[model samples]
Target: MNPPPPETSNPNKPKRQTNQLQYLLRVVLKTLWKHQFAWPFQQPVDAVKLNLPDYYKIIKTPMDMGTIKKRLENNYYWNAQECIQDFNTMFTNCYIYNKPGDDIVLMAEALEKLFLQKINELPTEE
Candidate 1:
């Protein structure tokens, strides 16, 4: 038999456990979206309109629930860690741009707590 040629894994290719992980990921995502504090973190922040002149300059990497949802739907994530990273990035960006005691920052903390709880509830696959 001919040996298979080595190749980089395709982003669109489904992983063996993708079905189980992605299903649970979507469930967790939905729970985050439905939270009361979700509105502030739903979409990418509008720096200019919000009058936060130095926002983009300060926050190098930006993430949001909407973007995460889109990527999930597109299968952009390879594993649970990648999705978790994005969620963490979103919270990190919030903490960086907003004051510690700010409402948005507090909401970000709340959402992060909810996310961690939901993520932990997902059953580990063999």
Candidate 2:
């Protein structure tokens, strides 16, 4: 199902998506384009370059905050904002505030942190 356009009530803020799966795709693409990974290829092909699963499809961002809130109810009601805040900080660090750029070590850090967090969260023997 196609999602509606993003809400712009704040006008200064980016709108969150309503669809769970679609929101994931939207962020996936946003990250790609933000890093110029989507520069040369077309939309669908860019997703393929990232090797997304066959069931995935990119569409418009969902504009309903309520829906976004509902979908992000991960384990204990996790939200996308918390996830992206870390990435956003990393993004700023790499951009160097639009000055001389620094390479981000964080991309790897995020991977490590996320994997460790998930693995640690699993039930274990005492």
Candidate 3:
């Protein structure tokens, strides 16, 4: 009976789940920004902004990234995947231009504007 050499059982450096998720998100966003996306701005801020109001309507305000991550991870909330898809599509339309000739739509711009429009249309508190 024997064991391997003494090594770090560190297990990803025992990082906090919240920090792990946040770091991954930032990495993706920055990659998108630096790649074909080339977005002048980058952050989860727009994603968070697009979401916070609905979250407040469902519950309350002043929640931070960790809180939202908790809800999404713990199943208090759903649609995280779809939200990521939104980013994907916007990156596509903004950067990929999924067409051949003379057909151009700035989907990132369109999605943000459309999101604002829909968000504005939401029914206010009664």
Candidate 4:
């Protein structure tokens, strides 16, 4: 009779999986940064320089790729979902500030779509 292998749960398994997920999340951030339309989103909006006085008033919390990158480096996000929330905030801010006919808004929308597509491609957690 073949003996069933003794089940020994690896204590490091969860930690290893967490590290892998974090690495994958970082790759997604880099991919988004490389996009051509990423220029506008690369940094926080210069409200005073651009004379968009209403920007600060409208966007309660301004978000950008640079800030997101910094947060990621600092391990500010608990998981990929939190990181995705920042991306959504950034794009939503753009939509709220810019007019419907503005070209930058179009770029923001395109980038947002790409981000969602990439996020959806990630492996689902069991």
Best by TM-score: 1
Per-candidate local distance difference test = 0.71, 0.35, 0.35, 0.69
- Residue 62 local lDDT, model 1: 66
Badly placed stretches (over 4 Å) of model 4 are: 1-24
Cα lDDT over the full model 2: 0.35
For candidate 4, lDDT tens digit of each residue in 42-96? 8777877777777777777776778677666654554566667767888887888
How do the residues 5-122 of candidate 2 rate in per-residue lDDT, one tens digit apiece?
2222334444454444244445443344354322222222223454534312332222222233233332212334443443344333324322343233434345435434543333
Question: What's the true lDDT of residue 66 in model 3?
Answer: 35
The per-prediction CA RMSD against the true structure, in angstroms, equals 9.1, 14.7, 18.3, 14.2
Better of 1 and 2 by lDDT: 1
Score candidate 4 by lDDT: 0.69
What tens-digit string does per-residue lDDT give for candidate 3 at 1-126?
A: 112211322333333334334433454333333444233223322325454334223321222223333333443312234334444443343343233332234435543454445334333332
TM values, all candidates: 0.81, 0.25, 0.26, 0.78
Give model 2's clash tally.
0
* Regions of candidate 1 where Cα sits further than 4 Å from its true position: 1-17
